[PDB]
PDB file of C-alpha atoms in Angstrom:
ATOM      1  CA  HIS A   1      70.549  86.395 113.243  1.00 15.59           C
ATOM      2  CA  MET A   2      72.014  83.772 115.577  1.00 11.71           C
ATOM      3  CA  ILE A   3      75.154  85.293 117.133  1.00 14.45           C
ATOM      4  CA  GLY A   4      78.007  84.057 114.877  1.00 14.47           C
ATOM      5  CA  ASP A   5      75.915  83.129 111.755  1.00 16.19           C
ATOM      6  CA  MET A   6      76.801  86.208 109.722  1.00 13.95           C
ATOM      7  CA  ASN A   7      80.381  85.367 110.352  1.00 16.42           C
ATOM      8  CA  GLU A   8      80.012  82.026 108.546  1.00 13.24           C
ATOM      9  CA  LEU A   9      78.208  83.571 105.553  1.00 12.46           C
ATOM     10  CA  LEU A  10      80.936  86.142 105.178  1.00 12.83           C
ATOM     11  CA  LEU A  11      83.541  83.397 105.517  1.00 10.57           C
ATOM     12  CA  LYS A  12      81.950  81.538 102.627  1.00 11.57           C
ATOM     13  CA  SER A  13      81.959  84.755 100.611  1.00 11.45           C
ATOM     14  CA  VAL A  14      85.767  84.908 100.724  1.00  8.53           C
ATOM     15  CA  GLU A  15      86.659  81.276 100.084  1.00  7.51           C
ATOM     16  CA  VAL A  16      87.841  82.537  96.651  1.00  7.82           C
ATOM     17  CA  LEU A  17      89.391  85.998  96.604  1.00  9.58           C
ATOM     18  CA  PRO A  18      90.734  87.466  93.354  1.00  6.76           C
ATOM     19  CA  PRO A  19      93.920  89.576  93.195  1.00  5.96           C
ATOM     20  CA  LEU A  20      93.724  93.288  92.371  1.00  5.52           C
ATOM     21  CA  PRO A  21      93.820  93.686  88.556  1.00  5.46           C
ATOM     22  CA  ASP A  22      96.891  95.907  89.121  1.00  5.90           C
ATOM     23  CA  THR A  23      98.694  93.167  90.965  1.00  8.20           C
ATOM     24  CA  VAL A  24      98.012  90.848  87.999  1.00  5.94           C
ATOM     25  CA  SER A  25      99.316  93.454  85.512  1.00  5.37           C
ATOM     26  CA  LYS A  26     102.446  94.365  87.483  1.00  8.35           C
ATOM     27  CA  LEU A  27     103.300  90.776  88.216  1.00 11.44           C
ATOM     28  CA  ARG A  28     102.781  89.685  84.607  1.00 13.16           C
ATOM     29  CA  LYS A  29     105.016  92.545  83.350  1.00 13.91           C
ATOM     30  CA  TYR A  30     107.766  91.850  85.892  1.00 12.53           C
ATOM     31  CA  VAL A  31     107.708  88.118  85.104  1.00 13.65           C
ATOM     32  CA  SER A  32     107.510  88.478  81.229  1.00 13.49           C
ATOM     33  CA  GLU A  33     110.479  90.813  81.272  1.00 11.08           C
ATOM     34  CA  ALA A  34     112.671  89.013  83.810  1.00 11.22           C
ATOM     35  CA  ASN A  35     116.010  86.146  87.074  1.00 11.97           C
ATOM     36  CA  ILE A  36     113.429  86.729  89.796  1.00  7.84           C
ATOM     37  CA  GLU A  37     113.987  88.994  92.776  1.00  7.19           C
ATOM     38  CA  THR A  38     111.805  88.205  95.843  1.00  7.55           C
ATOM     39  CA  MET A  39     111.793  91.882  96.853  1.00 10.40           C
ATOM     40  CA  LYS A  40     110.181  93.006  93.610  1.00 10.38           C
ATOM     41  CA  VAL A  41     107.503  90.349  94.062  1.00 14.86           C
ATOM     42  CA  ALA A  42     107.026  91.434  97.727  1.00 12.00           C
ATOM     43  CA  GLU A  43     106.630  95.037  96.721  1.00  7.51           C
ATOM     44  CA  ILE A  44     103.778  94.120  94.331  1.00 10.16           C
ATOM     45  CA  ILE A  45     102.005  91.792  96.805  1.00 12.09           C
ATOM     46  CA  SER A  46     102.406  93.999  99.893  1.00 12.99           C
ATOM     47  CA  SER A  47      99.948  96.635  98.623  1.00 10.08           C
ATOM     48  CA  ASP A  48      97.280  94.021  97.703  1.00  9.06           C
ATOM     49  CA  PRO A  49      94.961  93.359 100.662  1.00  2.00           C
ATOM     50  CA  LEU A  50      93.343  90.376  98.964  1.00  2.56           C
ATOM     51  CA  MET A  51      96.570  88.554  98.104  1.00  3.91           C
ATOM     52  CA  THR A  52      98.038  89.498 101.464  1.00  4.37           C
ATOM     53  CA  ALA A  53      95.140  87.589 102.999  1.00  5.31           C
ATOM     54  CA  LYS A  54      95.052  84.611 100.617  1.00  6.11           C
ATOM     55  CA  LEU A  55      98.817  84.147 100.620  1.00  8.01           C
ATOM     56  CA  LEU A  56      99.104  84.377 104.406  1.00  7.33           C
ATOM     57  CA  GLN A  57      96.256  81.878 104.654  1.00  6.30           C
ATOM     58  CA  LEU A  58      97.930  79.392 102.346  1.00  7.98           C
ATOM     59  CA  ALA A  59     101.271  79.906 104.059  1.00  7.60           C
ATOM     60  CA  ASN A  60      99.753  79.247 107.535  1.00 10.25           C
ATOM     61  CA  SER A  61      98.076  76.106 106.244  1.00 11.20           C
ATOM     62  CA  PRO A  62      98.904  72.698 107.865  1.00 12.77           C
ATOM     63  CA  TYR A  63     100.214  71.569 104.453  1.00 14.61           C
ATOM     64  CA  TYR A  64     103.438  73.527 105.247  1.00 13.21           C
ATOM     65  CA  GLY A  65     103.702  72.905 108.958  1.00 13.64           C
ATOM     66  CA  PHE A  66     104.275  76.524 110.055  1.00 14.17           C
ATOM     67  CA  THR A  67     100.641  77.062 111.145  1.00 17.35           C
ATOM     68  CA  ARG A  68     100.070  80.434 112.916  1.00 21.44           C
ATOM     69  CA  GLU A  69     103.760  81.271 112.498  1.00 20.19           C
ATOM     70  CA  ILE A  70     103.798  83.176 109.189  1.00 21.09           C
ATOM     71  CA  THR A  71     103.135  86.916 109.581  1.00 20.71           C
ATOM     72  CA  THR A  72     105.191  88.711 106.885  1.00 19.95           C
ATOM     73  CA  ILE A  73     105.191  88.885 103.073  1.00 18.62           C
ATOM     74  CA  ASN A  74     108.901  87.984 103.005  1.00 18.67           C
ATOM     75  CA  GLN A  75     108.189  84.852 105.057  1.00 18.75           C
ATOM     76  CA  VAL A  76     105.311  84.060 102.697  1.00 20.89           C
ATOM     77  CA  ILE A  77     107.620  84.313  99.701  1.00 24.42           C
ATOM     78  CA  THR A  78     110.279  82.235 101.465  1.00 29.38           C
ATOM     79  CA  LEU A  79     107.802  79.459 102.322  1.00 29.01           C
ATOM     80  CA  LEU A  80     105.510  79.432  99.253  1.00 28.93           C
ATOM     81  CA  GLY A  81     108.043  80.337  96.592  1.00 28.16           C
ATOM     82  CA  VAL A  82     107.516  82.735  93.721  1.00 25.98           C
ATOM     83  CA  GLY A  83     106.220  79.933  91.455  1.00 31.45           C
ATOM     84  CA  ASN A  84     103.141  79.330  93.613  1.00 31.51           C
ATOM     85  CA  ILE A  85     102.601  83.056  94.020  1.00 32.57           C
ATOM     86  CA  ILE A  86     102.660  83.613  90.281  1.00 32.23           C
ATOM     87  CA  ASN A  87     100.271  80.702  89.665  1.00 32.07           C
ATOM     88  CA  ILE A  88      97.866  82.012  92.300  1.00 30.34           C
ATOM     89  CA  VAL A  89      97.932  85.596  91.020  1.00 30.37           C
ATOM     90  CA  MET A  90      97.441  84.519  87.333  1.00 29.17           C
ATOM     91  CA  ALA A  91      94.607  82.162  88.174  1.00 31.93           C
ATOM     92  CA  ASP A  92      91.137  82.946  86.775  1.00 32.64           C
ATOM     93  CA  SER A  93      87.904  81.712  88.412  1.00 36.87           C
ATOM     94  CA  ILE A  94      85.539  82.179  85.466  1.00 36.05           C
ATOM     95  CA  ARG A  95      82.269  81.623  87.326  1.00 40.62           C
ATOM     96  CA  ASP A  96      83.437  83.538  90.427  1.00 39.15           C
ATOM     97  CA  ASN A  97      81.588  86.783  91.131  1.00 40.14           C
ATOM     98  CA  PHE A  98      83.662  88.562  93.817  1.00 38.37           C
ATOM     99  CA  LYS A  99      83.415  92.365  93.288  1.00 38.33           C
ATOM    100  CA  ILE A 100      86.290  94.624  94.259  1.00 40.10           C
ATOM    101  CA  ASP A 101      84.151  97.736  94.864  1.00 42.98           C
ATOM    102  CA  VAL A 102      84.076 100.041  97.888  1.00 42.30           C
ATOM    103  CA  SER A 103      81.366 102.279  96.534  1.00 41.65           C
ATOM    104  CA  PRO A 104      78.908 100.992  99.211  1.00 44.94           C
ATOM    105  CA  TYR A 105      81.051 102.878 101.744  1.00 43.18           C
ATOM    106  CA  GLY A 106      80.862 106.015  99.594  1.00 46.30           C
ATOM    107  CA  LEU A 107      84.446 105.561  98.378  1.00 45.06           C
ATOM    108  CA  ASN A 108      86.088 105.722  94.958  1.00 42.82           C
ATOM    109  CA  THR A 109      87.605 102.251  94.541  1.00 41.67           C
ATOM    110  CA  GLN A 110      90.572 103.356  92.470  1.00 44.80           C
ATOM    111  CA  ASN A 111      91.474 106.076  94.989  1.00 39.59           C
ATOM    112  CA  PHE A 112      91.043 103.661  97.892  1.00 38.37           C
ATOM    113  CA  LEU A 113      93.443 101.157  96.322  1.00 41.71           C
ATOM    114  CA  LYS A 114      95.959 103.911  95.511  1.00 40.48           C
ATOM    115  CA  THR A 115      95.804 105.104  99.129  1.00 38.03           C
ATOM    116  CA  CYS A 116      96.355 101.497 100.324  1.00 37.80           C
ATOM    117  CA  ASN A 117      99.679 101.572  98.435  1.00 34.02           C
ATOM    118  CA  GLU A 118     100.597 104.965  99.893  1.00 34.77           C
ATOM    119  CA  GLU A 119      99.839 103.598 103.359  1.00 32.60           C
ATOM    120  CA  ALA A 120     102.008 100.466 102.726  1.00 36.42           C
ATOM    121  CA  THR A 121     104.718 102.757 101.412  1.00 38.19           C
ATOM    122  CA  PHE A 122     104.433 105.041 104.443  1.00 41.32           C
ATOM    123  CA  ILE A 123     104.814 102.189 106.926  1.00 40.04           C
ATOM    124  CA  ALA A 124     108.119 101.058 105.325  1.00 36.41           C
ATOM    125  CA  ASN A 125     109.257 104.633 105.031  1.00 37.86           C
ATOM    126  CA  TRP A 126     108.463 105.342 108.663  1.00 42.51           C
ATOM    127  CA  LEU A 127     109.882 102.174 110.268  1.00 41.30           C
ATOM    128  CA  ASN A 128     112.276 100.179 107.989  1.00 40.17           C
ATOM    129  CA  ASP A 129     115.273 101.753 109.778  1.00 40.73           C
ATOM    130  CA  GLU A 130     113.740 102.425 113.213  1.00 43.05           C
ATOM    131  CA  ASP A 131     112.103  98.989 113.623  1.00 40.87           C
ATOM    132  CA  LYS A 132     112.403  96.728 110.564  1.00 42.85           C
ATOM    133  CA  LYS A 133     110.653  93.707 112.132  1.00 43.15           C
ATOM    134  CA  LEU A 134     107.682  95.914 113.068  1.00 45.73           C
ATOM    135  CA  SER A 135     107.495  97.401 109.529  1.00 42.54           C
ATOM    136  CA  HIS A 136     107.314  93.861 108.073  1.00 44.24           C
ATOM    137  CA  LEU A 137     104.504  92.896 110.489  1.00 43.18           C
ATOM    138  CA  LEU A 138     102.605  96.184 110.176  1.00 39.76           C
ATOM    139  CA  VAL A 139     102.130  96.456 106.437  1.00 37.58           C
ATOM    140  CA  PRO A 140     100.116  93.189 106.429  1.00 35.62           C
ATOM    141  CA  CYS A 141      98.175  94.391 109.514  1.00 35.43           C
ATOM    142  CA  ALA A 142      97.177  97.587 107.753  1.00 37.33           C
ATOM    143  CA  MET A 143      96.301  95.848 104.501  1.00 43.75           C
ATOM    144  CA  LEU A 144      94.254  93.273 106.380  1.00 43.82           C
ATOM    145  CA  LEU A 145      92.462  96.115 108.163  1.00 48.73           C
ATOM    146  CA  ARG A 146      91.639  97.634 104.749  1.00 52.58           C
ATOM    147  CA  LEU A 147      90.354  94.250 103.520  1.00 48.26           C
ATOM    148  CA  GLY A 148      87.469  94.541 106.042  1.00 44.96           C
ATOM    149  CA  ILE A 149      85.486  97.010 104.000  1.00 44.15           C
ATOM    150  CA  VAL A 150      86.388  95.243 100.721  1.00 44.66           C
ATOM    151  CA  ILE A 151      84.848  92.014 102.053  1.00 44.38           C
ATOM    152  CA  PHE A 152      81.845  93.877 103.495  1.00 43.86           C
ATOM    153  CA  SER A 153      81.266  95.791 100.284  1.00 44.72           C
ATOM    154  CA  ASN A 154      81.245  92.619  98.164  1.00 46.09           C
ATOM    155  CA  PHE A 155      78.870  90.911 100.573  1.00 47.57           C
ATOM    156  CA  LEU A 156      76.526  93.892 100.488  1.00 47.15           C
ATOM    157  CA  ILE A 157      76.618  93.983  96.698  1.00 46.19           C
ATOM    158  CA  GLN A 158      76.085  90.206  96.306  1.00 42.05           C
ATOM    159  CA  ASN A 159      73.039  90.490  98.566  1.00 44.40           C
ATOM    160  CA  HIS A 160      71.551  93.657  97.080  1.00 48.16           C
ATOM    161  CA  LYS A 161      71.928  95.732 100.284  1.00 45.80           C
ATOM    162  CA  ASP A 162      74.647  98.129  99.122  1.00 46.34           C
ATOM    163  CA  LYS A 163      72.335 100.968  98.183  1.00 47.30           C
ATOM    164  CA  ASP A 164      70.416 100.840 101.453  1.00 45.61           C
ATOM    165  CA  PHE A 165      73.727 100.561 103.352  1.00 45.11           C
ATOM    166  CA  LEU A 166      75.259 103.610 101.599  1.00 46.02           C
ATOM    167  CA  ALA A 167      72.054 105.666 102.123  1.00 45.61           C
ATOM    168  CA  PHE A 168      72.141 104.797 105.833  1.00 47.15           C
ATOM    169  CA  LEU A 169      75.884 105.459 106.093  1.00 47.21           C
ATOM    170  CA  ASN A 170      75.667 108.761 104.099  1.00 45.40           C
ATOM    171  CA  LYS A 171      72.991 109.915 106.494  1.00 45.69           C
ATOM    172  CA  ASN A 172      74.452 108.598 109.753  1.00 44.66           C
ATOM    173  CA  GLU A 173      78.208 108.800 109.130  1.00 41.93           C
ATOM    174  CA  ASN A 174      79.255 105.923 111.400  1.00 39.40           C
ATOM    175  CA  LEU A 175      80.751 102.772 109.870  1.00 39.26           C
ATOM    176  CA  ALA A 176      80.329 100.319 112.794  1.00 41.31           C
ATOM    177  CA  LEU A 177      76.709 101.382 113.351  1.00 40.52           C
ATOM    178  CA  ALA A 178      75.899 100.845 109.674  1.00 41.16           C
ATOM    179  CA  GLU A 179      77.685  97.486 109.673  1.00 44.13           C
ATOM    180  CA  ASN A 180      75.851  96.335 112.846  1.00 39.98           C
ATOM    181  CA  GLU A 181      72.542  97.523 111.304  1.00 38.94           C
ATOM    182  CA  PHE A 182      72.942  95.631 108.023  1.00 37.71           C
ATOM    183  CA  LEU A 183      75.276  92.729 108.847  1.00 36.94           C
ATOM    184  CA  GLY A 184      75.003  92.396 112.650  1.00 36.76           C
ATOM    185  CA  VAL A 185      78.761  92.661 113.031  1.00 37.10           C
ATOM    186  CA  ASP A 186      81.543  95.187 112.448  1.00 40.11           C
ATOM    187  CA  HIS A 187      84.467  94.485 110.099  1.00 41.40           C
ATOM    188  CA  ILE A 188      87.172  94.526 112.798  1.00 42.55           C
ATOM    189  CA  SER A 189      85.343  91.791 114.784  1.00 41.45           C
ATOM    190  CA  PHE A 190      84.830  89.856 111.602  1.00 41.77           C
ATOM    191  CA  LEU A 191      88.530  90.141 110.747  1.00 44.69           C
ATOM    192  CA  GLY A 192      89.372  88.623 114.171  1.00 42.47           C
ATOM    193  CA  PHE A 193      87.047  85.699 113.474  1.00 42.68           C
ATOM    194  CA  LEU A 194      88.238  85.322 109.916  1.00 42.53           C
ATOM    195  CA  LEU A 195      91.954  85.453 110.626  1.00 44.32           C
ATOM    196  CA  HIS A 196      91.751  83.101 113.612  1.00 46.70           C
ATOM    197  CA  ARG A 197      89.824  80.598 111.441  1.00 46.95           C
ATOM    198  CA  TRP A 198      92.525  80.958 108.767  1.00 48.87           C
ATOM    199  CA  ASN A 199      95.331  80.160 111.266  1.00 51.15           C
ATOM    200  CA  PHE A 200      96.960  83.601 111.350  1.00 50.65           C
ATOM    201  CA  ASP A 201      99.373  84.494 114.155  1.00 50.74           C
ATOM    202  CA  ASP A 202      97.762  85.802 117.377  1.00 52.10           C
ATOM    203  CA  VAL A 203      99.873  88.986 117.666  1.00 50.23           C
ATOM    204  CA  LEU A 204      98.949  90.087 114.148  1.00 50.53           C
ATOM    205  CA  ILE A 205      95.259  89.285 114.812  1.00 46.65           C
ATOM    206  CA  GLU A 206      95.178  91.108 118.149  1.00 47.90           C
ATOM    207  CA  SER A 207      96.954  94.195 116.774  1.00 49.21           C
ATOM    208  CA  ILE A 208      94.010  94.543 114.402  1.00 50.28           C
ATOM    209  CA  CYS A 209      91.377  93.756 117.055  1.00 52.76           C
ATOM    210  CA  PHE A 210      92.840  96.255 119.551  1.00 53.81           C
ATOM    211  CA  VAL A 211      93.410  99.029 117.019  1.00 54.41           C
ATOM    212  CA  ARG A 212      90.726 101.214 118.771  1.00 55.36           C
ATOM    213  CA  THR A 213      92.198 100.494 122.252  1.00 54.54           C
ATOM    214  CA  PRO A 214      95.932  99.881 121.899  1.00 59.49           C
ATOM    215  CA  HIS A 215      96.566 100.637 125.620  1.00 59.41           C
ATOM    216  CA  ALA A 216      94.393  97.592 126.441  1.00 61.54           C
ATOM    217  CA  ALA A 217      96.332  95.032 124.398  1.00 61.76           C
ATOM    218  CA  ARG A 218      98.648  92.432 125.857  1.00 62.39           C
ATOM    219  CA  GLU A 219     102.162  93.715 126.464  1.00 61.53           C
ATOM    220  CA  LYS A 220     103.617  91.954 123.420  1.00 58.20           C
ATOM    221  CA  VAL A 221     100.863  93.228 121.095  1.00 54.04           C
ATOM    222  CA  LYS A 222     100.901  96.880 122.256  1.00 52.78           C
ATOM    223  CA  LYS A 223     103.720  98.211 120.023  1.00 58.22           C
ATOM    224  CA  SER A 224     102.031  96.931 116.814  1.00 56.83           C
ATOM    225  CA  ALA A 225      98.509  97.863 117.959  1.00 56.46           C
ATOM    226  CA  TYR A 226      99.761 101.438 118.635  1.00 56.50           C
ATOM    227  CA  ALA A 227     101.628 101.647 115.343  1.00 57.02           C
ATOM    228  CA  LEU A 228      98.597 100.356 113.457  1.00 57.11           C
ATOM    229  CA  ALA A 229      96.308 102.885 115.149  1.00 57.86           C
ATOM    230  CA  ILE A 230      98.769 105.713 114.378  1.00 52.93           C
ATOM    231  CA  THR A 231      98.796 104.653 110.716  1.00 52.34           C
ATOM    232  CA  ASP A 232      95.038 104.249 110.566  1.00 51.16           C
ATOM    233  CA  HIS A 233      94.494 107.828 111.863  1.00 50.69           C
ATOM    234  CA  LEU A 234      96.717 108.902 109.000  1.00 49.23           C
ATOM    235  CA  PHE A 235      95.369 106.643 106.221  1.00 50.07           C
ATOM    236  CA  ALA A 236      91.760 105.660 107.037  1.00 49.72           C
ATOM    237  CA  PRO A 237      89.748 106.112 103.807  1.00 52.27           C
ATOM    238  CA  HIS A 238      87.020 108.398 105.183  1.00 53.76           C
ATOM    239  CA  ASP A 239      88.924 110.848 107.403  1.00 54.02           C
ATOM    240  CA  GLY A 240      92.625 109.900 107.337  1.00 53.01           C
ATOM    241  CA  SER A 241      95.007 112.786 108.210  1.00 51.62           C
ATOM    242  CA  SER A 242      92.182 115.246 109.029  1.00 50.07           C
ATOM    243  CA  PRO A 243      93.285 117.838 111.578  1.00 51.24           C
ATOM    244  CA  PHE A 244      91.689 115.690 114.291  1.00 48.80           C
ATOM    245  CA  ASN A 245      93.238 112.462 113.078  1.00 47.24           C
ATOM    246  CA  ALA A 246      96.705 113.871 112.419  1.00 45.01           C
ATOM    247  CA  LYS A 247      96.812 115.244 115.957  1.00 46.02           C
ATOM    248  CA  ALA A 248      95.456 111.979 117.304  1.00 44.86           C
ATOM    249  CA  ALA A 249      98.256 110.030 115.588  1.00 44.46           C
ATOM    250  CA  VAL A 250     100.938 112.230 117.242  1.00 44.55           C
ATOM    251  CA  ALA A 251      99.215 111.946 120.601  1.00 44.85           C
ATOM    252  CA  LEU A 252      99.193 108.154 120.374  1.00 42.48           C
ATOM    253  CA  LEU A 253     102.944 108.077 119.806  1.00 39.02           C
ATOM    254  CA  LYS A 254     103.332 109.991 123.072  1.00 38.06           C
ATOM    255  CA  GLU A 255     100.910 107.673 124.978  1.00 36.11           C
ATOM    256  CA  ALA A 256     102.892 104.528 123.901  1.00 32.76           C
ATOM    257  CA  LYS A 257     106.051 106.282 125.209  1.00 31.40           C
ATOM    258  CA  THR A 258     104.463 106.363 128.687  1.00 34.63           C
ATOM    259  CA  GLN A 259     104.515 102.537 128.733  1.00 36.34           C
ATOM    260  CA  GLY A 260     108.131 102.280 127.468  1.00 33.54           C
ATOM    261  CA  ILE A 261     107.200 101.644 123.838  1.00 28.95           C
ATOM    262  CA  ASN A 262     109.650 104.060 122.118  1.00 31.98           C
ATOM    263  CA  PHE A 263     108.582 105.730 118.937  1.00 32.48           C
ATOM    264  CA  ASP A 264     110.781 108.703 117.936  1.00 31.04           C
ATOM    265  CA  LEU A 265     108.394 111.690 117.879  1.00 29.01           C
ATOM    266  CA  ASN A 266     110.493 113.684 115.382  1.00 30.49           C
ATOM    267  CA  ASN A 267     110.863 110.709 113.045  1.00 29.20           C
ATOM    268  CA  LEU A 268     107.089 110.284 112.782  1.00 30.35           C
ATOM    269  CA  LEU A 269     106.495 114.050 112.328  1.00 31.43           C
ATOM    270  CA  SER A 270     109.069 114.316 109.509  1.00 34.01           C
ATOM    271  CA  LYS A 271     107.542 111.244 107.818  1.00 33.15           C
ATOM    272  CA  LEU A 272     103.878 112.343 108.181  1.00 28.57           C
ATOM    273  CA  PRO A 273     102.014 112.717 104.896  1.00 27.80           C
ATOM    274  CA  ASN A 274     101.746 116.361 103.726  1.00 29.39           C
ATOM    275  CA  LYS A 275      98.011 116.370 104.360  1.00 29.07           C
ATOM    276  CA  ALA A 276      98.610 115.419 107.957  1.00 29.65           C
ATOM    277  CA  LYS A 277     101.517 117.860 108.443  1.00 32.21           C
ATOM    278  CA  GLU A 278      99.466 120.696 107.060  1.00 32.93           C
ATOM    279  CA  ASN A 279      96.449 119.711 109.195  1.00 30.67           C
ATOM    280  CA  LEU A 280      98.357 119.336 112.494  1.00 34.20           C
ATOM    281  CA  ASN A 281      97.690 122.985 113.482  1.00 37.00           C
ATOM    282  CA  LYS A 282      94.151 123.438 111.985  1.00 39.36           C
ATOM    283  CA  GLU A 283      90.933 123.335 114.067  1.00 39.13           C
ATOM    284  CA  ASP A 284      89.099 119.981 114.294  1.00 42.25           C
TER     285      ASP A 284
END
């Protein structure tokens, strides 16, 4: 009600975040059957929005003295070690009631999580050769973006507003308007508040915050804001890779080029998901 209050409630709601059950299963299998490879651990974590957030938070903590300097899952693994990561992923907060459930947004949770992994996979596929440093930054950006609606959904469910929210959203078809109506804030703004409070790096934060206006970001944030917006047009849960959104992704690559940010047009096109490729010529 007071500008900034909702932000603090939401913050409290994510003081404990569980891992995805799939992360727990994959990590337990890999560990039981292993000596440890960091890359295999990274591959499991990198598709988990919740662990991405908690692990980056812990890694940017004053305890380690690299505050606001850790932005990648590889850096996280390097700083934290696999031992801490295992212990955090296997942990069980018995009394904790965090719900991993995007049904308030009209989404199938299992499909949403599977598409998160396809998006993570796409980013690496698209950029690991072309711009490896950007790929390493961008996967966490995209996962953190996806965490927005996971946090919002849990909050709505904990507070018995999820049904009213879904009804409103089903009827009105605009996420930010529904969020402002029920929470007083949108999830992208909240992510900016949240990630600043948790000592994340400013370029990562601002890539997320400027995803809707990448041209308006600071010069050093533009490349990643553009790349995140391209990805989001392709992988957004509600309308990712629609004719409109597929075209809009390609267009954005060409706009970034006008400012001397060089994405290879052909490389993106050849790497587009099938849905997007097939939609590129259809009417909006």
